[PDB]
């Protein structure tokens, strides 16, 4: 008998629907992320950070410092051999 009006009721609609939560989630997820690996600070030196940079990053990751640390125990007690026996 009259004009019905659901073309323009998106005003208080855009809270209730389910991907609104994902939309408001990832507009918050996307702003403070650094763009392209920026602010990396790829070099730092504290007399042993170079040891981590050469040995303990994701790139090198080989067991050799263990080997070095193995030799460290080989370096340790054998000298104590020369202190004891």
């Amino acid at each position: 008998v009259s004009t019905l009006i659901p073309p323009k009721v998106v005003s208080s609609k855009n809270i209730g629907s389910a991907p609104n939560a994902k939309r408001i989630a990832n507009v918050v997820h996307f702003y403070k992320s650094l763009p392209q690996g920026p602010a990396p600070a790829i070099k730092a030196n504290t007399r042993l950070a170079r040891y981590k940079a050469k040995y303990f990053d994701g790139d090198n990751a080989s067991g050799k410092p263990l080997w070095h640390f193995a030799l460290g125990i080989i370096a340790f007690g054998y000298s104590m051999e020369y202190y004891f026996h």
Binding site: V1, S2, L4, I5, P6, V9, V10, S12, K13, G16, S17
Partner: protein, 89 residues
């Protein structure tokens, strides 16, 4: 032709006291004036409807109205039910 003449004179004159002079009728035993111009004159309004169809009823239409000037307490309901449709949409 006096055959034709006397035939047409009796043909004219024998109902001429039923048409020209209104001395109603001699051979017909019921009277003639209360048959057609008195009884049957209201015949078509005895054969059709009286005092509505023949008087024809120049009648005023029923003035149909709008939604009685109430937006609020039903436009808010239309708005919330439209929210519910767009939920279902």
């Amino acid at each position: 032709q006096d055959l034709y003449l006397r035939e047409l004179k009796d043909t004219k004159l024998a109902p001429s006291t039923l048409q020209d002079a209104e001395g109603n009728v001699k051979p017909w035993n019921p009277p003639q004036k209360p048959n057609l111009p008195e009884l049957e004159l209201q015949g078509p309004e005895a054969l059709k409807a009286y005092t509505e169809q023949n008087v024809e009823t120049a009648h005023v239409a029923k003035e149909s109205e709008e939604g009685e000037s109430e937006p609020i307490e039903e436009d808010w309901l239309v708005l919330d039910d439209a929210e519910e449709t767009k939920e279902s949409h």
